[PDB]
Design a protein around this ligand. Structure first.
Ligand SMILES: Cc1cn([C@H]2C[C@H](O)[C@@H](COP(=O)(O)OP(=O)(O)OP(=O)(O)O)O2)c(=O)[nH]c1=O
Ligand SMILES: Cc1cn([C@H]2C[C@H](O)[C@@H](COP(=O)(O)OP(=O)(O)OP(=O)(O)O)O2)c(=O)[nH]c1=O
Ligand SMILES: Cc1cn([C@H]2C[C@H](O)[C@@H](COP(=O)(O)OP(=O)(O)OP(=O)(O)O)O2)c(=O)[nH]c1=O
Ligand SMILES: Cc1cn([C@H]2C[C@H](O)[C@@H](COP(=O)(O)OP(=O)(O)OP(=O)(O)O)O2)c(=O)[nH]c1=O
Ligand SMILES: [Mg+2]
Ligand SMILES: [Mg+2]
Ligand SMILES: [Mg+2]
Ligand SMILES: [Mg+2]
Lengths: 291, 291, 291, 291
């Protein structure tokens, strides 16, 4: 049993005219609120206790949209991050929550998708001790955090915003840790930008020499929706595969269902209140079979 | 001098998993909040006094995003619609605001765009006496309120979601009314659907013979963003013409500027706070010229 | 060992201004000629002897683009269909070619794609006796040939463009036949539409009780590129998953390579002559591995 | 009265797996063959005598698709360019055709579109003597031909593939000349790449000091469809504005019609043979009016 956290705060300045009003994580990726995506990841990893960190201003909107999470058969807790001081701060803010157990942090503006992702997730979630990060092959390795490594990964360097070289495997917003995490967090100096950067915490695990690295292969898709254009690419992608290939991405009630987290009765209440929606029919359709 | 109102409430059920958290009118059409679009219309019509009607829950989000409107050189007032009882209700709720003057109602989920649009708005705006609705040839007449008319228009009929024929021109969410408007709305009774329909207010100017129709010809684009798919079509469209043809749609500060509503100094404060955005550079670029 | 045929003729009237010049099957689905797609299917089914039936006018263009097929490690033969008299005619025209062996017909304007597809093809291919058609749940049953079936399938019926009901599974342009095939095609008479329909050949295996159905489940995508809009949907789809998920669809040299049909040396000559292309680099990249 | 030429040859290597079979200019930009676009430009400029230069292999396909051009009320002549030796060669190859008159060259892979383009065209086509080129604002001024200038343009430098600076106004595939053109062409040395580059000919006019420069403003869209990705952008663009804004781009019969080049009777024969197509209905619809 492990716990999960989702950073759903931030000022989201790069989407600015828009995020001046509503939190970036409430914006839509096709037919589902953005936060539905990072959440589904944690659920595919089999994590039911999840703390969502948001700004004081957006909180009620998230609660208004997710409630206590009982609708998805999960236990949701909320916590406010007063000012956007950096990612590492999640562990400080989430100390009392994590207690002393191991965790999983997922950035709120990240979309992940590939065949047989759930397993890969579980396996890595079977690691008591250490720290795993998920790299992805980028074409623009400068404007992304890079991680080097060799057989067994281990990682030999985590040069972020490399001034010139490194490797081309960017590290995504999917992190796994262990107890020592609240520790490393408590000691972290504000970056030039001026925020407790999660990279600093990952640095420590590298030297401590227990920073394994999970490889996200070819069939895997990864996006960091935080700019006007990437927000569109994300939407268009999900819409394309959902309509073209017949399955839904980040459909929470469906993930819960199969995970035995909620009974057919539960899925039916959901599909009903969404019946007028393509998301709802997709749910009604799962309530049967073909020849 | 005329006044404008924008219906920005509603339950937005057709976009449901999403609108369970944030109002539909705060969602993005590419790089701008949806409401930026109906608003720009009123501004292109030369209207500075605008009342925005929203739900009690979303209000602060709108204020948080639009303020008093001084940033766009316009006078914004807000009012709450307790429960989504229909469109005609805007005039009831907006009585004290309209006072006795003529008005312009624009639905919050409507995107309008074409060349020469404004001149067409001013002309239709310069009228003081009657009512004015715009048609657009839809391909789904059933699913739209339709206007049959004759020479000069007038409109012999106006059948709602005509389960059968009519004509193929749908009535867009753009309307112009005179003082008799608030009078009408008070005598509208709930449709079979249970809301107070704007169509009723229109069936009244029809009979009174005071109902002119304005045709949204060929080069104009019209959308009613209220479904998951139309929300994407809208976004993709604005992104395509903005990037392909070089201008911005519904860029408020730019509309204000040319309208002499705000000085270069004003446009510069804006473009600055958006500098990290494509919307911002577009603004910086207008602050000059080419050979 | 089995043989395959690809119908790549037709008048392609629905894409008309365009197909007045070039055959529909030479048009592009993103970065590859349309015909590359039906072909890859046959290759994924492990079929190396393939007859391509084209019009007399387009022939040299196909040869000019595909040659004898040695570049993809396959044996290509060509044959001309004088006039577009229907699909069943492929077996007549292809008699001398098929000889007495079993076959596989794939329409030229069909795009197929899903995970685990091949294994499914081999299994359906390993059969020697009967007939095999694939269904895909369309949303437009009228506009498609449909298959009603029961447990194991069989198919109780097969109504063409059923002006009324049936089921919602459309018969894709992928078929498997045995020697009795050419026998059937000879006794097919022209439909009301005036062509010799493949459906007729199918109605014959139905009655004979030798007609199995293969369901193209959820993760599979299917398209019939023959209209201006579906041609765009297809392109946009392949481009999206290729760029989003990192693999190439219908990349012949790559299919050949893994099938042991062509050596690394072969793949390198190809990737070289395409080096200036994204298709080429994808090939160079397969010529190695990662940690 | 002036003459026009369209370079529709080339090896089109950047679209390679595809162009190994069919000429790039026969590929589709949505619902119309690519060549329909450059052609429409010449027609919007009011030019009826047009020479199309193609490869020996593609010729019959173009003829098969365009005939003598009488269907669009224009006089089409064809000429073969044996080997793709460069653009300047058009004037050599087209000497006997141009005779001694002034001309207009339009590259075959260029798509142009903006409101009030036709006028701008005509005006520039009213220039006997000199040479006009059309620049467009690019964001990637390196991989494009640049042109500097000041009041009256004149152009002060034509640095192509600038190793480092210049201006950001790329020059498009739309050129206008005068007699002295066959002259300048006859004397041109093969570039490093190894082809008679049109840029070399434009150089001469700059020094001769009679190389005016037409400015393609904001609302204008320009694309150079010669790569897999730009081919898709082009299609998606045309499809978007055509469906979103209700008009057709590069609809030849319609351009002829208004130009008085072909009578209603002619447009009706066309719309008929395309009736099953969206292009055809668009034509039937122009054969009337609304209230
Ligand atoms: C900086 C910060 C980010 N976040 C969230 C926001 C994102 O979902 C995710 C990644 O941060 P970013 O992707 O940087 O998003 P952002 O909110 O910082 O906005 P921008 O950089 O464009 O101005 O982490 C917090 O929850 N708290 C924080 O202090
Ligand atoms: C019914 C109603 C709509 N509106 C707004 C919402 C829309 O922008 C616009 C048009 O109404 P709709 O487009 O119908 O939107 P909606 O909010 O009713 O949601 P849905 O029909 O999908 O369930 O009017 C109000 O502001 N108050 C209302 O009572
Ligand atoms: C009718 C016919 C089709 N074909 C091919 C064309 C297609 O790839 C495939 C399916 O036929 P269609 O998809 O019908 O294509 P088509 O060429 O008939 O053109 P349209 O219906 O739009 O006018 O079979 C032949 O090869 N020979 C034929 O006689
Ligand atoms: C080089 C050349 C190009 N053309 C045409 C092709 C194009 O429409 C246009 C522009 O040339 P390009 O855009 O360079 O096209 P291309 O055919 O050279 O192919 P690529 O560069 O990708 O390998 O001019 C000729 O007609 N004859 C020629 O000799
Ligand atoms: Mg981010
Ligand atoms: Mg609506
Ligand atoms: Mg077909
Ligand atoms: Mg080019």
């Amino acid at each position: 049993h492990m716990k999960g956290i989702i950073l759903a705060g931030g000022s989201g300045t790069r989407l600015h005219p828009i995020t001046r009003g509503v939190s970036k994580q409430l914006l839509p990726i096709y037919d589902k609120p953005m936060i539905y995506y990072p959440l589904s990841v944690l659920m595919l990893a089999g994590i039911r206790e999840i703390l969502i960190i948001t700004t004081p201003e957006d909180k009620g909107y998230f609660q208004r949209l997710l409630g206590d999470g009982s609708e998805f058969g999960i236990q949701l807790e909320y916590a406010e991050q007063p000012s956007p001081d950096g990612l590492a701060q999640a562990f400080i803010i989430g100390e009392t929550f994590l207690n002393g157990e191991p965790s999983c942090l997922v950035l709120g503006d990240n979309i992940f998708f590939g065949q047989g992702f759930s397993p890969k997730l579980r396996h890595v979630a079977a690691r008591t001790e250490g720290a795993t990060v998920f790299g992805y092959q980028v074409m623009d390795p400068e404007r992304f955090g890079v991680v080097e490594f060799d057989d067994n990964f281990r990682a030999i360097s985590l040069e972020e915003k490399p001034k010139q070289p490194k490797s081309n495997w960017a590290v995504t917003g999917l992190y796994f840790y262990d107890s020592k995490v609240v520790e490393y967090a408590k000691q972290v100096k504000p970056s030039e930008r001026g925020e407790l950067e999660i990279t600093s915490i990952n640095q420590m695990y590298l030297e401590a020499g227990n920073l394994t690295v999970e490889l996200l292969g070819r069939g895997f898709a990864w996006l960091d929706t935080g700019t006007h254009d990437s927000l569109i690419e994300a939407s268009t992608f999900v819409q394309t595969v959902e309509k073209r290939q017949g399955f839904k991405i980040a459909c929470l009630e469906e993930i819960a269902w199969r995970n035995g987290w909620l009974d057919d009765e539960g899925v039916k209440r959901a599909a009903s209140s969404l019946a007028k929606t393509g998301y709802g029919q997709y749910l009604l359709e799962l309530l049967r079979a073909r020849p």
